[PDB]
């Protein structure tokens, strides 16, 4: 549940009646280009014409490529399942690659009577659920399987996904690749865009999501503050909007829980600019923390 505790402000994707994208609505701010585009995708699952393809969200990290995956899982009925897996959660040695790839994949398909997914019910498993559609007792609601960090999935599990999506009752899956013309894992010589091979590139709609402005970044950390119930000021928020455009947004949203409690250490309830001026020096990001060990070695 912590996998979507960083997205507990999205109650919908936030589009108006004409299929356009407005600025700040239902949680999502900025991003009006690609929020038009994932409005096309959620309308292509409400009309069932998503004939076996997927979505790849190219762009830099921290710009919101996971919040749309909960937004698409909000606009598609809001009771659909959702399992955000990461491409490094497959590389485990206690279990095989493909089963922990399929255990999330058998968790995304929602069935309607109680509300169940296929993984509670987990060939012959595939057919009795296809029999219940024939009687008309339970109709499948395909949720969203979010696969972050998709270049860490190898070519030996992609062709499994090219099979388990080729079947009819599979859900919409959404990749997310923050890199460029990468070299495919598990095959040592061949390269392709985003670390996704050619046989899966025929089934993706590459929706680019762009970076942010400091004005857009100040809206969103207010929303994460107002949802956790932590009163921050504008002078403090403007610093987090300059720590946001410095490193990422995922770092700057992460500091809200400690920098609030720095005021609880000091007795106050609110976040002022002198607090964030200290916790930037107390906790660091990840890129500059390897700059220090590149400095304290090379001094």
């Amino acid at each position: 549940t912590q996998r979507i505790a960083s997205h507990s402000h999205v109650k919908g994707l936030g589009l108006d009646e004409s299929g356009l994208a407005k600025q700040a609505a239902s949680g999502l701010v900025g991003q009006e280009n690609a929020r038009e585009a994932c409005g096309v995708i959620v309308e292509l699952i409400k009309s069932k014409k998503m004939a076996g393809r997927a979505v790849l969200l190219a762009g830099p990290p921290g710009t919101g490529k996971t919040a749309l995956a909960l937004a698409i899982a909000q606009e598609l009925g809001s009771k659909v399942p959702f399992c955000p897996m990461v491409g490094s959660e497959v590389y485990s040695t206690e279990i095989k690659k493909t089963e922990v790839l399929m255990e999330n994949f058998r968790r995304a398909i929602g069935l309607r009577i109680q509300d169940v997914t296929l993984h509670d019910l987990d060939g012959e498993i595939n057919k009795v659920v296809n029999k219940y559609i024939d009687q008309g007792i339970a109709e499948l609601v395909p949720g969203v399987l979010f696969v972050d960090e998709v270049h860490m999935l190898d070519i030996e599990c992609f062709t499994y996904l090219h099979r388990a999506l080729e079947s009819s009752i599979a859900p919409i899956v959404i990749f997310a690749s923050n890199r460029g013309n990468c070299v495919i894992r598990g095959t040592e010589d061949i390269t392709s865009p985003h670390g996704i091979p050619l046989d899966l590139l025929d089934r993706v709609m590459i929706i680019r999501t762009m970076l942010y402005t400091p004005q857009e970044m100040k809206q969103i950390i207010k929303i994460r503050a107002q949802t956790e119930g932590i009163n921050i000021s504008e002078e403090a928020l403007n610093h987090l909007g300059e720590i946001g455009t410095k490193t990422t947004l995922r770092y700057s949203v992460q500091l809200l829980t400690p920098a609030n409690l720095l005021a609880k250490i000091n007795g106050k309830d609110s976040i002022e600019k002198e607090h964030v001026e200290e916790i930037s020096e107390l906790f660091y990001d990840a890129k500059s923390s390897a700059k220090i060990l590149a400095d304290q070695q090379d001094k």
């Binding site: 280009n33 585009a37 762009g59 062709t159 460029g180 095959t187 985003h194 025929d202």
Partner: protein
């Protein structure tokens, strides 16, 4: 159901008669295309014309990278899959001890309700089979049941998997001296209108006769399947302005949204560098 390919279709007729005159035992076909030139239907171009009961199978050259089973046992099933006996012509995978089925069908041939036939077997992305599997088709072709193997690649002078030397097309020389290598010249401007006029009819879309002239101007530098992914979403956006057909302003609405693989690796060069 082709479009264009004024040369490489004609080569599929010359290769077709070699299956009739028996002069193909030992040889195979290499289709050295681009990714988006549609080689797989040309592989069926000698399966809708050789025989209406002659079967086929399409297994990728990366599909043999298998974790549940071994490399070649999964291949030999997909090699036996192309060889049928008339009764519907049942394949040699559904009669599946490993040589007894070979020995039993050595008897059934003259009976009258069982007769051997060759087939077509398509291996696409062939350059990801290593030298362990090129030695398998070095010997499985020499059996009495040699199917017409068609190999498909998009890799030039490369390194063989399993060895470290240079080679054309990921093929070692012993299975390359005796090949028929056909080239598929990529799609052209009149060649791209007719496939795109086919594709809209397959999704009940009335399209303009000017937005085609930009969709075929846009379906050349990127791909064909990029102009395929648009045209089902180009229908939905006019389904939200309620205009019942699609004009020239409507692709450049959805060409701005849905990127292609070439403007989304350069846009991962703006940030990443």
């Amino acid at each position: 159901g082709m479009v264009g390919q004024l040369a490489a279709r004609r080569a599929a007729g010359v290769v077709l008669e070699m299956i009739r005159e028996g002069k193909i035992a030992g040889r195979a076909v290499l289709i050295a295309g681009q990714p988006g030139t549609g080689k797989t239907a040309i592989a069926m171009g000698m399966a809708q014309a050789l025989g209406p009961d002659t079967p086929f199978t399409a297994i990728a050259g990366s599909e043999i990278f298998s974790l549940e089973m071994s490399k070649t046992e999964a291949l030999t099933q997909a090699f036996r899959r192309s060889i049928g006996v008339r009764i519907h012509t049942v394949s040699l995978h559904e009669i599946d001890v490993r040589e007894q089925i070979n020995a039993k069908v050595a008897e059934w041939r003259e009976e009258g309700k069982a007769e051997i036939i060759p087939g077509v077997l398509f291996i696409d992305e062939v350059h990801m089979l290593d030298i362990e599997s090129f030695s398998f088709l070095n010997r499985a072709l020499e059996s009495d049941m040699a199917p017409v193997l068609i190999m498909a690649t998009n890799r030039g002078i490369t390194r063989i998997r399993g060895t470290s030397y240079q080679s054309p097309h990921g093929i070692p020389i012993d299975l390359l001296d005796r090949l028929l290598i056909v080239s598929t010249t990529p799609y052209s401007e009149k060649d791209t209108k007719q496939i795109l006029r086919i594709r809209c009819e397959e999704e009940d879309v009335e399209m303009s006769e000017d937005a085609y002239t930009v969709l075929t101007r846009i379906g050349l530098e990127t791909s064909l399947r990029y102009a395929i992914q648009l045209i089902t979403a180009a229908s939905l956006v006019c389904r939200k302005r309620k205009g019942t057909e699609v004009q020239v302003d409507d692709i450049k609405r959805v060409y701005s949204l849905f990127l292609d693989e070439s403007r989304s690796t350069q846009y991962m060069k703006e940030y990443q560098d």
